[PDB]
Write a protein that binds this DNA or RNA. Structure first.
Lengths: 747, 621, 676
RNA sequence: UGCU
């Protein structure tokens, strides 16, 4: 029973105290030092003894057990003649495991399933991949770090220990540790290790879970546009002579996170000084229950908007400069790619300044597109050499023209017009179309030669024979691949431009206003209630729910919202409010009701029911009114625009329901009368002895009961969280102080 | 990064240039404490307003120009050395945030500003508590408790306490006598301060020459090298015994064996044939380990050390001098080419029976087909049978090792053809082996069937005549001592097949990849310098003789072979460069051939490789 | 060798695999190391002057030589002080991010370094037992020595350990008390000599060299000091383009490929080695380079002193001579010390200190691979050199992009001279330059169009490991898989290696032919069903990564009834001697302690068939660690931080576990009653 | 006492 474990622990503690009178006078923190003292497990050349060791009379050492017969069918399975130690001393014949393969006690099938869980996952993963057709061919390897094995959930390295602590020993954690843990991974890991922990020891299960949520990237030679997303199958699907075609999609939420980040960046560029707006909004948005900073840290993707948001949070980005379908990486350059504000005065009133980027000094850029791989060297706007490793007879139109656009080498466009300039995208499209139908600028820029050794044909094809050949274009003699030695650190511009710190300045890496990507689904569980952009939601129900959660749960936001709606001032949620209420004629009555409710009760912004009534009145007040219709009295309830959802002033039904016990907004209990934590908790105390208040079992256990004071245990210390009485968080008070300092500095 | 989680990113980046943290004791902890103080300052002025202006004005981490500008407007002046952290509009007086280890017995530090003292547990002193509101106290206590949790989690309690106290040790220091000990063997002190101005002088160098012609390896002069290897190699044969176990085969051999000496060597006396006969008789009964006899002392060199030392002591005369060990130089023997030619002879069996792996995918089928092709093109060859004999002999000699035996152990070398018949290559006799290390030698009596006898090739072998079933055979019967490590290495000799398989696989797969289709039956033409002239030659026979040369190289691996092969890689690369119209340039005193020639002493296969290098052209146009 | 030089299908670079005699025996060393040790001692003195004058070189403390004294036609021992200063300044001015990372490491990472990192080493010379001992044993005995001589406790950090080492040096007499009981005495001079003593010893089983070399090991009194400088050097080297030592495997190949850009008219590629490395490098040059790095970083004095301790200790090194030079009268063999009778090392008699010999020049040992790499890299930074350089320790490759051949030759000679300025001599017979680049070698990696795979560098790992059938099969198959992934072995070689490994692995466990195991299985009607039992292989080329048991279960080759027996967690074969603790996810009692066995019955333990007090102390430490792990599940995921000593910490933890056990109050009382 |  449960008492046997306590008995065993007590006897172990007593024996360790008696058998080791010293080794406990040391501090507990000395464990990190003396856990490594495990000598006498060392051995030398076990492989040079295996043949003899197996062929010894008694090779196997096991504990004394009665399940192994002394003699079975004339063979002596075990030997107890010597018994020098008599404990872990009896020796067994080499055939004992073979004997046990039969004639042995069995185990439940659940145990067998639990033991082979990860190996079975690997086997089904192998037998579930489509074994395609082998495509033999010469291949130029690309050495990159790739994930060793797939993970059930990707978590940033800082949050792995807290996730494991929440999975295995929640009773010895604090609320900060719980907040830093990935709760989705916690649930997945708990479900996975429920049967596994019954057959694996503590450390074995801990590190099995760690491996299930650890990336563990390793460098391997891969094939471009054939990345198997994991090195589990590289020996089968890849080599220097073949690949096996496979059809596997991403099945990852990185695309949705890109969509969310793109919406945030696009809406942030429309305000004043977008950088701090984006930073503040990223600190107020939560996907599922995880803060946006942590989920950005979790997903280290190649995508542009994800990279911009990761840089805004101080993290790194792996994004590479991409033109159409060709990726460019600067091997080394004298100066960063500069930009020229080429103004076009084609018309006096109609003039557009279209800026392009070029090189100054010498530079060497690696390019990759499909199977085409190589590098080129340039000086200023002149190409010196190009080396390409491409399959024979391949058309090199698009990669070469992407190179020309990247370096601004050919000069029909950029500084010129080849026709009136209007917008960046139109000019780029015209450039590409013009050079697609007229690709002679490359030939007049590079020159022609009659040598047959040069592989680039005048029609921009690889190894096709022709009378003339394109000069200074040769085959890639040696493998070339980008590699950065120093840890690149990125700089985010005030206009949300991602820069890389080059020696002589700043190198542009990601630049919005030309990142073309259509809108996509948002990540599930996204919470925009605390952010300034609720209109990102495309669903009226979600918009209304987020707006009402913002107003109800916080008094100051309700104050600001009511004030802006009543006085027609600019509000962050003007678009949402205008899109929620149909075109009506209740604005004047709503503003009136606001006036009498404010005058009658100056102390209204403390009862959530009053906040709900004021929010309803303000939402109607800030609605889009109709001109050619006389104003009417505000109704008790109205219907959301383009929907059958009812919003009610009395909050008896529909979108908001305020029962005596609790308030429900959009089917979710936002506020509970006595058991809730809307204002949060603060730590308030670390002690080595239990304080004078209740000790909860786990941090989440104390978060549900909602006591005024409770403690948690974590490595011999007690943390007694009580309550938050301040009406502001640390982040925005720090923001206010920093802005006040900088707004005294400006004079 | 290095930012603590509880520290805000803006505060962390603002603190980077405020103080030079590298020179301060516990610079990281000092920066963290300053960040704590600035965060406390931020929390004190938590969006408080007064007369349409912030209640508190924060001086901390602000440029001195603005500080003086706003202090002048407030009719207050503070000295440069100590400046208050913040100023309160209500109850007008300057405040400074202080962190103290003990809240008790604390007095104001300066008479120009007030002190807002806090302890590491978040508590505040009485005047600070009454000045500030309850919300500010709770915020400060919560932030300080989060900081304390971070401190105790990272085991930084002592560093934080020392930083808060104000005084701490330099975290490292060197005393006086230790400094004197250190400065004993150097002309500079602990932190050297040479008086010379930095400069990179110009030094007259030399000129880089060009390797216009490839180096010529030195061919040593001396007697031809004897066959110095554990077993016979290409001159190995076997007797086709009737099917049965090892005991039956040994009984059948011994019961019908007529042994007569035809050539006796001084190294191996002909009288130790009785040792082999006794071992055969004992193994034919079922007792592989037998007792010692009189001629076992001669056969296994029992106690030879004592008589050698006694003879040395009796003959000891003269003066002590240094060792000056010498290695006799030997020339390339004629039998190396014969060994290469004879090792390629075809056989009637495959001699490579490796169980096939499973086949699930098409890649698996391709790999197994390639392996089967390689096995069938190198299997039916004498070298494969010799490799099998070496494997069996080495493993059966190594398995009876690891013990301290004072008796004699017999280790037969028997293989079985795919018809049940036993094939008796020979027998290895293991003598008294009180082995303790991995390099100490174990005495052996290697007796095995010989195909052809040669005095110059086998000077230490005593060849006997074996008469079994109206057939005539030969017996080697050499006395050798052989170490544990070498026996273990030769127990895994089957790995030698990988490199010729590597060459074959690379050729086939390159042909498949260039034309984008697998063939698996290609037997192309390989251009090689056979007799000093480039002539075509098929891939299969090339792989066969590559396997033969690799096997001959493996069993003759020694320091000379290791150095030779390590130092020929540079010359191989230089030749490959020269064959592609590339020039090779060398430093002033560059003689890459000397580091190869120093490794050419007496190894017959090293000499064979050197002659092969010399024969092929050295100048490329 | 003509058979290894194809001309039509493949190139000799691909056949460089054939220039390997591996799978043959590796050479070993037999007798006295005294001659080799004395040769390594005398070589630095022979190279200081252009004309070898050993007697005039033994009185030199700091090896600093004028630029006109630097030998250009041979090895040159010593450095130019002004050259070192200027080149270190140039290397600091460039690669500013590397210096920023160095400052980050000094401020953040260095204080968190623990002296338990010293336990990761192999056999270490012990100044107490005058022998070679495993690193944990030597570290623990050194910690006890410091604790009982300084009368205080040593902090877990490495800085505290180094400070304790420095503090003990200030004492006049030090003593060591240890269980057998026995007491040994150290003076300041004796303990200083033991601090600066390197234990020399042969290097066995080394391939690729004709002559045997000697390796050395330092004591724990200086390994800690070397650890800081090595970690700082690694931090710097990870952020500089010209380094090649901190990266390895495929990352090193990617870094090399990033520099194989040949676009100018004359594009050379120089690949070579440095001759007489580790003995032409004065530690004072490394001192000066580190001092310049720390001065230009604004570092205080204490860190400079800490960084300079190890190189001075190596300036005062005492190399342990062997058991004597071999002398013969007739056919006798006697071993005599250096100074007994004349030899070729008579000039070094004055440096004899007991059985050890001093050497103020050179390093004598590769204890500063990263620092020597930094010293090599600082010399590269100069205006004349415009190519790409990669240096690991003493193997380097250089890529030239020059307009004319004469300019390339001038750059190559400038490279040679600037290497010689800091005491690094290019091996003339080992450095080869190809004027059109495209063919080269670095760390035995040959590239012509791409880095070609090198078979026979993976053959030594193809032998079964000898632990148990499951572990052996798993690790052999995964080694083969890694070789396939890295390009060393292709489809055919991979499958052939699989077959050879499988056949040897089945032989080693008595699964082929008629053996005792096979006979027992046959007479008792036990079908194998497993690879180690003689069954047909289940693993294929594409299934190298799959576990045997899971794959057999999936394919139906292993039925569930036998699975219920093989994977029994209660089998006697792999039963543990003590109970183990188990987690219980979402349970009233989250920890249950019970007897356990390794699930697989074929993961048995093979008996091995044959400072004792320190071993019992290790066992006591293991017991304390086991009880701490049982009572503190959270130290398995994060570092231990509970306050107080071990006894009180576990006492309160055991209590708190009891009051949450959900039992009766009086039962909790009776459980607490018997807690010591 | 049995590896092609």
């Amino acid at each position: 029973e449960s008492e046997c474990t306590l008995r065993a622990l007590v006897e172990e503690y007593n024996g360790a105290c008696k058998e080791a009178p010293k080794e406990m006078s040391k501090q507990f923190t000395d464990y990190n030092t003396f856990k490594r003292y495990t000598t006498s497990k060392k051995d030398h050349a076990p492989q040079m003894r295996l043949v003899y060791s197996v062929r010894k009379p008694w090779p196997i050492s096991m504990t004394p057990s009665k399940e192994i017969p002394l003699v079975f069918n004339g063979t002596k399975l075990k030997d107890t003649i010597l018994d020098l130690g008599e404990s872990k001393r009896t020796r067994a014949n080499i055939v004992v495991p073979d004997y046990w393969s039969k004639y042995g006690s069995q185990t439940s099938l659940e145990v067998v399933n639990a033991i082979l869980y990860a190996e079975d996952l690997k086997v089904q993963r192998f037998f579930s991949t489509e074994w395609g057709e082998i495509r033999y061919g010469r291949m130029l390897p690309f050495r990159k770090p790739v994930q060793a094995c797939p993970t059930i959930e990707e978590v940033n390295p800082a949050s792995i220990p807290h996730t494991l602590l929440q999975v295995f020993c929640p009773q010895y954690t604090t609320l900060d540790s719980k907040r830093k843990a990935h709760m989705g991974a916690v649930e997945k890991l708990k479900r996975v290790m429920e049967p596994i922990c019954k057959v694996q020891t503590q450390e074995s299960a801990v590190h099995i879970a760690r491996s299930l949520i650890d990336s563990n990237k390793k460098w391997l030679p891969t094939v471009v546009d054939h990345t198997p997303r994991t090195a589990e199958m590289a020996h089968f699907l890849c080599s220097k002579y073949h690949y096996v075609h496979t059809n596997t999609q991403d099945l990852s939420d990185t695309r949705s996170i890109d969509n969310l980040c793109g919406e945030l960046v696009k809406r942030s560029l429309k305000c004043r000084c977008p950088k701090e707006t984006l930073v503040a909004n990223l600190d107020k948005i939560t996907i599922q229950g995880r803060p946006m900073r942590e989920v950005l840290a979790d997903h280290d993707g190649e995508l542009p908007y994800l990279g911009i948001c990761r840089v805004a949070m101080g993290l790194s980005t792996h994004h590479t400069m991409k033109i159409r379908s060709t990726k460019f990486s600067i091997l080394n350059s004298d100066h960063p790619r500069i930009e020229v504000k080429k103004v076009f005065s084609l018309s006096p009133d109609v003039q557009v300044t279209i800026p392009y980027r070029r090189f100054k000094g010498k530079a060497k850029v690696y390019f990759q597109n499909d199977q085409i791989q190589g590098y080129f060297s340039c000086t200023d706007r002149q190409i010196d050499e190009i080396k390409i490793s491409a399959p024979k007879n391949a058309p090199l139109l698009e990669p070469l023209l992407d190179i020309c656009y990247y370096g601004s080498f050919i000069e029909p466009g950029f500084e010129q017009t080849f026709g009136y300039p209007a917008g960046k995208r139109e000019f780029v499209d015209s450039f590409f179309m013009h050079h697609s139908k007229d690709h002679k600028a490359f030939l007049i820029h590079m020159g022609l030669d009659k040598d047959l050794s040069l592989p680039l044909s005048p029609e921009l094809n690889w190894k096709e024979p022709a009378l003339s050949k394109v000069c200074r274009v040769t085959e890639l003699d040696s493998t070339v691949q980008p590699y950065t030695s120093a840890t690149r650190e990125f700089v985010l511009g005030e206009t949300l431009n991602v820069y890389t710190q080059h020696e002589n300045g700043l190198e542009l890496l990601i630049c919005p206003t030309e990142i073309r990507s259509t809108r996509g689904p948002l990540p599930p569980g996204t919470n925009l209630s605390g952010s300034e952009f609720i209109d990102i939601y495309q669903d009226p129900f979600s918009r209304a729910k987020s707006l009402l959660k913002s107003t109800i749960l916080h008094a100051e936001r309700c104050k600001e919202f009511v004030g802006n709606m009543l006085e027609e001032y600019q509000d962050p949620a003007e678009t949402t409010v205008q899109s929620l209420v149909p075109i009506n004629t209740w604005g004047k009555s709503a503003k009136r009701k606001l006036q009498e409710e404010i005058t009658s009760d100056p102390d209204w912004h403390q009862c959530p029911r009053k906040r709900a009534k004021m929010s309803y009145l303000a939402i109607i007040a800030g609605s889009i009114q109709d001109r050619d219709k006389k104003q009417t009295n505000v109704p008790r309830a109205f219907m959301l625009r383009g929907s059958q959802i009812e919003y009610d002033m009395k909050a008896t039904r529909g979108l908001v329901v305020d029962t005596t016990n609790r308030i429900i907004v959009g089917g979710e209990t936002v506020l509970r009368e006595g058991k809730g934590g809307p204002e949060g908790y603060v730590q308030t105390g670390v002690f080595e002895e239990q304080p004078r208040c209740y000790l909860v079992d786990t941090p989440d256990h104390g978060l549900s009961m909602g006591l005024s004071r409770f403690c948690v245990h974590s490595q011999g210390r007690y943390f007694q969280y009580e309550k938050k009485i301040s009406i502001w968080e640390e982040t925005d008070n720090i923001k206010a102080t920093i802005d006040s300092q900088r707004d005294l500095k400006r004079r | 990064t290095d930012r603590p989680d509880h520290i805000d990113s803006r505060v962390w980046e603002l603190s980077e240039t405020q103080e030079d943290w590298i020179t301060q004791v516990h610079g990281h902890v000092r920066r963290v404490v300053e960040c704590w103080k600035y965060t406390i300052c931020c929390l004190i002025s938590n969006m408080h307003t007064h007369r349409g202006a912030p209640q508190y004005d924060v001086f901390k981490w602000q440029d001195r120009s603005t500080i003086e500008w706003i202090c002048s407007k407030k009719k207050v002046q503070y000295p440069e050395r100590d400046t208050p952290d913040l100023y309160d509009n209500e109850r007008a007086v300057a405040y400074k945030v202080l962190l103290v280890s003990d809240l008790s017995d604390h007095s104001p530090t300066s008479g120009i500003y007030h002190d807002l003292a806090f302890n590491l547990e978040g508590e505040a002193e009485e005047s600070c508590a009454l000045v500030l509101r309850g919300s500010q106290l709770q915020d400060i206590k919560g932030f300080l408790c989060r900081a304390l949790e971070w401190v105790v989690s990272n085991n930084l309690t002592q560093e934080v306490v020392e930083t808060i106290s104000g005084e701490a040790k330099l975290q490292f220091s060197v005393g006086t006598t230790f400094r004197t000990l250190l400065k004993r063997d150097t002309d500079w002190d602990v932190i050297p301060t040479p008086r010379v101005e930095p400069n990179v002088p110009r030094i007259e160098g030399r000129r880089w020459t060009q390797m216009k012609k490839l180096p010529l390896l030195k061919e040593k002069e001396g007697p031809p090298s004897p066959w110095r290897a554990l077993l016979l190699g290409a001159d190995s044969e076997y007797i086709v015994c009737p099917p049965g176990t090892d005991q039956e085969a040994i009984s059948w051999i011994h019961s019908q064996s007529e042994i007569e000496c035809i050539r006796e060597s001084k190294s191996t006396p002909a009288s130790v044939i009785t040792c082999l006969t006794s071992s055969l008789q004992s193994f034919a009964e079922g007792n592989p380990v037998r007792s010692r006899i009189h001629e076992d002392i001669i056969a296994f060199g029992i106690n030879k050390k004592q008589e050698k030392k006694q003879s040395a002591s009796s003959s000891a005369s003269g003066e002590w001098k240094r060792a000056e060990y010498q290695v006799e130089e030997m020339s390339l023997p004629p039998w190396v080419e014969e060994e290469m030619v004879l090792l390629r002879s075809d056989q009637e069996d495959n001699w490579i029976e490796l169980e096939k792996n499973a086949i699930y995918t098409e890649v698996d089928g391709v790999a197994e087909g390639l392996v089967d092709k390689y096995i069938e093109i190198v299997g039916r060859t004498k070298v494969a049978s010799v490799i099998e004999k070496w494997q069996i002999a080495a493993t059966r000699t190594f398995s009876q090792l690891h013990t301290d035996r004072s008796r004699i152990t017999a280790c037969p070398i028997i293989t079985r053809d795919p018809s049940g018949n036993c094939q008796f290559w020979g027998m290895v006799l293991l003598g008294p082996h009180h082995v303790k290390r991995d390099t100490d030698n174990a005495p052996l009596l290697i007796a095995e069937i010989m195909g052809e006898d040669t005095e110059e090739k086998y000077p230490k072998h005593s060849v006997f005549s074996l008469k079994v079933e109206e057939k005539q055979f030969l017996l080697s019967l050499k006395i050798t001592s052989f170490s544990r490590n070498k026996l273990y290495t030769f127990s895994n000799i089957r790995r030698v097949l990988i490199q010729p398989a590597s060459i074959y696989s690379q050729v086939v797969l390159s042909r498949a990849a260039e034309n984008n289709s697998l063939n698996l039956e290609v037997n192309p033409e390989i251009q090689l310098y056979l007799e000093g002239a480039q002539r075509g030659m098929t891939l299969y026979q090339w792989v066969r003789m590559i396997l033969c040369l690799e096997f001959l190289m493996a069993i003759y691996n020694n320091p000379q072979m290791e150095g030779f092969l390590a130092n020929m890689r540079r010359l191989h690369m230089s030749r490959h460069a020269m064959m592609e119209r590339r020039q090779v340039f060398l430093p002033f005193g560059s003689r890459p051939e000397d580091k190869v020639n120093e490794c050419i002493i007496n190894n017959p296969i090293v000499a064979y490789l050197a002659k092969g290098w010399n024969s092929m052209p050295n100048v490329y146009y | 060798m003509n058979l290894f030089t194809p001309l039509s299908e493949i190139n000799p670079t691909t056949t460089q695999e054939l220039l390997y005699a591996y799978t043959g025996p590796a050479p070993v060393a037999y007798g006295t190391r005294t001659r080799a040790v004395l040769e390594n001692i005398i070589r630095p003195y022979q190279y200081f002057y252009k004309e070898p004058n050993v007697q005039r070189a033994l009185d030199i403390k700091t090896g600093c030589k004028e630029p006109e004294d630097i030998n250009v036609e041979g090895p040159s021992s010593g450095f130019h002080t002004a050259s070192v200063l200027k080149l270190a300044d140039n290397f600091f001015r460039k690669y500013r991010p590397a210096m920023e990372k160095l400052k980050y490491w000094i401020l953040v990472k260095l204080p968190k370094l623990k002296y338990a990192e010293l336990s990761k080493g192999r056999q270490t010379y012990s100044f107490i037992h005058k022998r070679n001992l495993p690193a944990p044993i030597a570290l623990e005995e050194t910690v006890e020595f410091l604790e009982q001589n300084l009368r205080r406790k040593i902090g877990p950090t490495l800085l505290s350990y180094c400070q304790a080492i420095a503090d003990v040096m200030e004492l006049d007499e030090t003593t060591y008390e240890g269980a057998r009981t026995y007491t040994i005495k150290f003076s300041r001079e004796e303990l200083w000599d033991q601090m600066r003593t390197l234990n020399t010893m042969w290097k066995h089983l080394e391939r690729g060299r004709l002559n045997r070399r000697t390796i050395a090991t330092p004591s724990m009194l200086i390994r800690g000091f070397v650890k800081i400088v090595e970690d700082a050097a690694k931090e710097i080297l990870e952020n500089v383009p010209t380094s090649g030592v901190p990266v390895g495997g495929e990352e090193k190949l990617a870094k090399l490929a990033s520099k194989q850009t040949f676009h100018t008219a004359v594009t050379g590629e120089l690949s070579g080695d440095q001759e007489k490395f580790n003995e032409c490098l004065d530690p004072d040059a490394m001192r000066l380079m580190w001092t310049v790095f720390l001065r230009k970083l604004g570092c205080p004095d204490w860190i400079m002193e800490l960084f300079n301790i190890p190189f001075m200790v190596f300036k005062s090194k005492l190399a342990d001579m062997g058991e004597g030079l071999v002398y013969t009268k007739g056919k006798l063999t006697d071993r005599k010390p250096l100074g007994e009778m004349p030899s070729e090392f008579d000039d070094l008699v004055r440096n004899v200190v007991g059985n050890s010999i001093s050497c103020r020049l050179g390093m004598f040992m590769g204890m500063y691979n990263l620092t020597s790499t930094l010293l090599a890299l600082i010399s590269i930074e100069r205006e004349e050199l415009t190519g790409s350089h990669v240096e690991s320790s003493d193997d380097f490759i250089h890529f030239f992009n020059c307009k004319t051949h004469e300019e390339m030759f001038k750059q190559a000679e400038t490279l040679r001279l600037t290497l010689k300025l800091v005491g690094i001599n290019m091996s003339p017979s080992k450095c080869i330059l190809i004027s059109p680049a495209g063919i080269g070698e670095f760390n035995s990696k040959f590239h012509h169009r791409d880095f070609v795979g090198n078979v026979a560098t993976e053959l030594p790992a193809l032998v079964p490991n000898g632990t148990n059938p499951m572990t052996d099969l798993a690790m052999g198959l995964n080694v083969i898989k890694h070789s396939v992934n890295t390009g060393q072995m292709n489809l055919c070689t991979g499958a052939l290696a699989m077959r050879i490994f499988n056949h040897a692995y089945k032989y080693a466990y008595m699964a082929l032919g008629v053996t005792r195991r096979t006979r027992f299985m046959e007479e008792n009607a036990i079908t194998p069903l497993l690879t180690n039992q003689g069954a047909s292989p289940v693993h294929s080329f594409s299934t190298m990564h799959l576990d045997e048991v899971a794959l057999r279960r999936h394919l139906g080759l292993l039925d569930e009834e036998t699975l219920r027996r093989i994977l029994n967690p209660n089998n006697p074969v792999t039963q543990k001697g003590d109970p183990s603790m188990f987690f219980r996810i979402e349970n009233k009692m989250p920890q249950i302690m019970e007897d356990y066995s390794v699930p697989s019955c074929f993961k048995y333990t093979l008996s091995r068939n044959r400072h004792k007090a320190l071993l019992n102390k290790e066992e006591r430490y293991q017991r304390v660690t086991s009880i701490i792990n049982k009572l503190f599940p959270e130290v398995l995921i994060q570092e231990a931080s509970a306050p107080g000593t071990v006894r009180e910490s576990l006492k309160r933890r055991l209590e708190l576990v009891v009051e949450r056990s959900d039992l009766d109050e009086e039962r909790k009382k009776r459980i607490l009653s018997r807690i010591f």
